[PDB]
Design a protein around this nucleic acid. Structure first.
Lengths: 143, 206, 262
RNA sequence: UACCUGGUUGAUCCUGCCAGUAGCAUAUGCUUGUCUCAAAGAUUAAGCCAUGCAUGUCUAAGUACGCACGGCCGGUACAGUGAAACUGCGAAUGGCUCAUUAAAUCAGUUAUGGUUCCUUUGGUCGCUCGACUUGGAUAACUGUGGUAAUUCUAGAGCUAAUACAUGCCGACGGGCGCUGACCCCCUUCGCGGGGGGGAUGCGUGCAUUUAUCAGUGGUGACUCUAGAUAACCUCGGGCCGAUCGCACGCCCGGCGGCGACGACCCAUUCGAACGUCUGCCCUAUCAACUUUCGAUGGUAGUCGCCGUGCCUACCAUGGUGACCACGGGUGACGGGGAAUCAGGGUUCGAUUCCGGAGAGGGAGCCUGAGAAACGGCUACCACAUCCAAGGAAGGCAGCAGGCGCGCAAAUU
RNA sequence: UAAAGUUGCUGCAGUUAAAAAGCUCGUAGUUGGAUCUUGGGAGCGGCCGUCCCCUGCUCGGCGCCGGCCCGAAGCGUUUACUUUGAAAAAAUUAGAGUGUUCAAAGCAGGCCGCCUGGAUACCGCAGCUAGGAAUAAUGGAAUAGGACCGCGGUUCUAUUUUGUUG
RNA sequence: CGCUACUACCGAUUGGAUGGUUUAGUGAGGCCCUCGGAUCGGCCCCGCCGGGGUGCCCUGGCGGAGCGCUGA
């Protein structure tokens, strides 16, 4: 099911080789009133870069965006649309900044178009500085 | 020299950078330790802030931990078996963090046979001829033999470790960075970890 | 720069020192110490600009190396020693004692205190630490690591230390209705009762403060110091009392005082 | 101050530009009595540089046998002024310049729960259970020298430490974890059951490194802080003081005041580093670019002060783009700012404040808390200086100053 | 730089002066119809003008015989917009005071030891914060996996509870 | 078409000059690792005699070499 790498995958904190006669799982509350999901606690995945079950702390900026690509593994590309004010032509221009953001596999059901909230943290990779905190599903798309 | 710079390499977009400053000091690489199994040779390196950093280049012992019953002993490192990172750091027996090394068992076998008072390892048929740990299996008082008995009730070791203690060599996972701290400390593989790494050594074997 | 800076330009000096423009290229760069570079007031600037006991910075070297100056209970001989908030400068041969309290404008003023008042000072705590053998530790706003404090003292409470011994006597707890000297930002030098705490997980907690003439204003909790339980301060206050009369009212009182006096 | 005016026609009304008009900031002409401020080799050549100077430093308190000076109650060493030399510290700031640099730098904004930090300030500094002061070099000095030459140094005779080293006594009498001889008390016909004392030995403080167990104080949240267990302890070696000065006293030799210096670790300060969000000029006669000499991810390492393709190995095929990526140009260091300006704007900002970068071009490193330092070192390339031809020495985009360059810029 | 409304957002032009693609489709871009809270209760001044009100669910204090009146932390569509607040180096600019003899400057000064000053404003965008909810986007229940109701069951589980120890 | 003058353009010349990036081959110099070992020690040894204790021992000045050991 899991542990497909050459090295053994496990949570660093929890010890799994106590003498006997289901493994226990490390999680945490992330803070800022963001609820740790069910699939983080009940799930069997192992991700060092999960903000719920990994070695990463959310601090500084909480942002949002729209999930636009999901082709990278364990990480997604979101897209932040905003309006920049040119003061000469007393008007806005539509501008966007797409950022690579790490997508914890506790978020099992995520589709492109879903409005994701992201939290600033330590740099996870060259271009990733943001973990996904929660996913709100797209306008309609109940089916 | 060899740099640890974020500016020498392309952006998200794939655009090359023009460098605005020459190599800084703090943007530093020092050549890899690539520490081996031999008589203890550790070279102290001055690092940032006038603090020290111990480059192990040879290292043959380590403070390994048997986490089941929480005992740890200074034990001889005898062979590197498997490295998940690079397959060629097994032939060139390089100790790095998360290496799979064979270590001696005799400190743990000594502890077990002194704490539980049960013959562990010891291939069936033979005896102990010096009669030292033969006497350390027997000859207790009234209430302390009862203490060893209450302990003996729940003293079962796994058949995987029983096999490895029999050959005289446990499998250990290096947890310390011998390049950095100059030590080869770690833990002994047990349960799913041991079954996993024995499967990976078996797959590499043929 | 490829190491620490050792000079401060006269222009780049903080505005609350009230150093003039034209005398020198350089300002006295405060030595490292208890207070921050831009929150302190060097001994030299207190000794030759505020009180004018010296003329030059070589006179201030002669004053301080006679060991006549005693900042918060210990004699310093550094002209660029950072003397900051609530510090007690005891010039002993003159028989004088000064507390560095912020005036209604962001400067430190010449606030003379009695020799009895000059024996204690009030210290805001910065953090609670648990030392190497379960030893509880305070750290004050002036870097005093006071170990084995009262367990009810938490961060953002103030403690009354005795200079001579360096031990806590009383403490005000950070609760609503308590007096508050504002020691940072636009409201630097205001005194008012804390009327509201406004929590912000992650970001900076803001604190609304009502004044002695109902002039309510906000402030970041970092920039706040409690100077007495309820409405009675544990220090003596400078004239203006951190009430902050407006520039129209300042003009009125200055004009009334000049015309009435003669 | 929200302003126009002359010029196409035979004359007219227009479009429309040319020219006038007022600043401003560079040059230059002619003229110049007083007085107060004041820019000033930026533009061209970050071109080359003769000479001089620009970073040194001693308190009562690291080290004084230079008679270089100098007092007399000397034999219980050392009066005091003290060159030199060792040691410590500084030389990483300041100053100069704008070549490079276009999401870089920089600005506002956050973060460091992801790091380092000489100094300062406040903590810690008989927390460890095991000599009333140790070792032998070296410099100044003395004395023989070598080379044409340097801030070149060699050999020999001495002699100091807060240099380099080595290291005990005390607190110290015992606690606490195992160990475990021995021994006590109760129930049972007894074995058995069940509860206390205990010789000996092994460890134990903080720091380092690993593994485990439980959940004092704190945060919005730690795999935090603290606690306990098991150990480990880098011979290129964490701490636990072989240091110095003032006034000196009380006590049948012990005990003590006020400092200076040093020190593990913590905090604080000064910072520094790497990240967050947002913001930059022209260009499409630059439309696709990036990628098995890392491009975007994942896993595990190496390295690093730490976070991270920073770098390996193995997988995955991603990443960016008409919302202008990628490439090119810039007489582009960025900002605070400056000039004009009714309202908008336009232009400039080499230049005293902040931040960045560089020391002729690249590169590499020593020492240190801090440098990829150039008034440090090592090469190469370029140019250039002494020379007895064997060699030695260099870095004014520091202050003066010279040459060159120029329309263009001051005193060795 | 203004003059240049001769680069035009304010604010220019395109029948004939220079200028509308030959025509249509068309994806980004840009702009998008109407429509979803209104009438009142209360007081002051001389029918009118300003003012107070049209969401609920742990711990306390105006208290009362578990409830009600009231306050505090939290939960309570998303923005844009606007208003306030926090914060943002000085120098410069605006600007307060002050006879540098005036002024540019300066940050000083003024009283027969004392009395004072060294203000204040501005600081585009982006980030933080609390009002407002018109305007503009945006959301829902339409095979009902729609609410708000109390009910029947199931799985895991803080433990309040059997003098103390299973 | 012709005269005069000016300004760009084209191009025979595998043109020429200042650069910059780079495939390939060589590669100074530092740093790291690794083998080094010139040189300088200190030590155990017996050859030599005391002081003291009692042939033996604690030691004090003079040289030797197995270079024997380990150190820089």
């Amino acid at each position: 099911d899991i542990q497909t790498e050459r090295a053994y995958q496990k949570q660093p904190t929890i010890f799994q080789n106590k003498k006997r006669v289901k493994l226990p799982r490390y999680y945490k509350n992330i803070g800022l009133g963001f609820k740790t999901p069910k699939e983080a606690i009940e799930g069997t995945y192992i991700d060092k870069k999960c903000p719920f079950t990994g070695n990463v702390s959310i601090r500084g900026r909480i942002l949002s965006g729209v999930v636009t690509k999901m082709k990278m593994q364990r990480t997604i590309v979101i897209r932040r649309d905003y309006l920049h004010y040119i003061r000469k032509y007393n008007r806005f221009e539509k501008r966007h900044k797409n950022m690579s953001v790490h997508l914890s596999p506790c978020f099992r059901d995520v589709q492109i178009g879903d409005i994701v909230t992201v939290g600033e943290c330590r740099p996870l990779s060259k271009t990733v500085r943001f973990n996904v905190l929660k996913v709100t599903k797209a306008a309609g798309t109940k089916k | 020299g060899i740099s640890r710079d974020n500016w020498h390499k392309r952006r998200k977009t794939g655009g090359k950078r023009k460098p605005y400053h020459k190599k800084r000091k703090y943007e530093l690489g020092r050549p890899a330790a690539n520490t081996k199994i031999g008589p203890r040779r550790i070279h102290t390196v001055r690092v940032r802030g006038g603090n020290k950093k111990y480059r192990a280049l040879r290292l043959d012992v380590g403070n390994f931990s048997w986490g089941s019953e929480c005992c740890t002993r200074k034990t001889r490192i005898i062979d590197v078996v498997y490295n998940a990172s690079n397959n060629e750091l097994v032939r060139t027996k390089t100790l790095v963090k998360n290496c799979i090394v064979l270590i001696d068992s005799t400190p743990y076998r000594q502890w077990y046979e002194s704490h539980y008072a049960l013959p562990l390892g010891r291939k069936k048929g033979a005896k102990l001829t010096p009669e030292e740990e033969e006497i350390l299996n027997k000859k207790r008082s009234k209430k302390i033999q009862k203490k060893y008995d209450e302990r003996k009730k729940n003293a079962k070791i796994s058949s995987l470790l029983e096999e490895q203690f029999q050959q005289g060599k446990l499998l250990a996972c290096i947890a310390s960075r011998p390049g950095q701290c100059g030590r080869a400390d770690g833990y002994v593989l047990e349960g799913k970890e041991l079954e996993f790494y024995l499967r990976k050594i078996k797959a590499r074997k043929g | 720069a490829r190491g620490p800076k050792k000079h401060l330009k006269r222009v780049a000096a903080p505005k609350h020192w009230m150093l003039d423009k034209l005398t020198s290229v350089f300002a006295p760069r405060p030595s490292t110490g208890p207070h921050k570079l831009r929150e302190c007031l060097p001994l030299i600037i207190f000794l030759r600009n505020k009180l004018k006991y010296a003329l030059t910075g070589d006179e201030v070297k002669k004053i301080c190396m006679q060991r006549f100056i005693k900042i918060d209970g210990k004699v310093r001989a550094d002209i660029t020693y950072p003397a900051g908030f609530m510090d007690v400068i005891s010039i002993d041969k003159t028989g004088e004692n000064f507390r560095l309290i912020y005036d209604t404008k962001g400067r430190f003023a010449v606030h003379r205190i009695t020799p009895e008042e000059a024996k204690y000072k009030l210290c805001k705590v910065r953090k609670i630490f648990v030392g190497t053998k379960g030893i509880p530790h305070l750290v004050t706003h002036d870097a005093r690591t006071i170990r084995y404090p009262d367990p009810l003292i938490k961060m953002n409470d103030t403690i009354q230390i005795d200079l001579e011994t360096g031990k806590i006597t009383d403490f005000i707890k950070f609760d609503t209705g308590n007096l508050c000297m504002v020691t940072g930002g636009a409201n630097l030098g205001r005194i008012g009762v804390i009327t509201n705490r406004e929590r912000h997980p992650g970001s900076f907690d803001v604190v609304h403060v009502k004044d002695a003439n109902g002039n309510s204003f906000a402030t970041r909790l970092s920039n706040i110091f409690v100077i007495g339980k309820g409405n009675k301060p544990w220090i003596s206050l400078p004239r203006g009392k951190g009430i902050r009369l407006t520039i129209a009212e300042e003009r009125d009182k200055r004009l009334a005082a000049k015309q009435s006096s003669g």
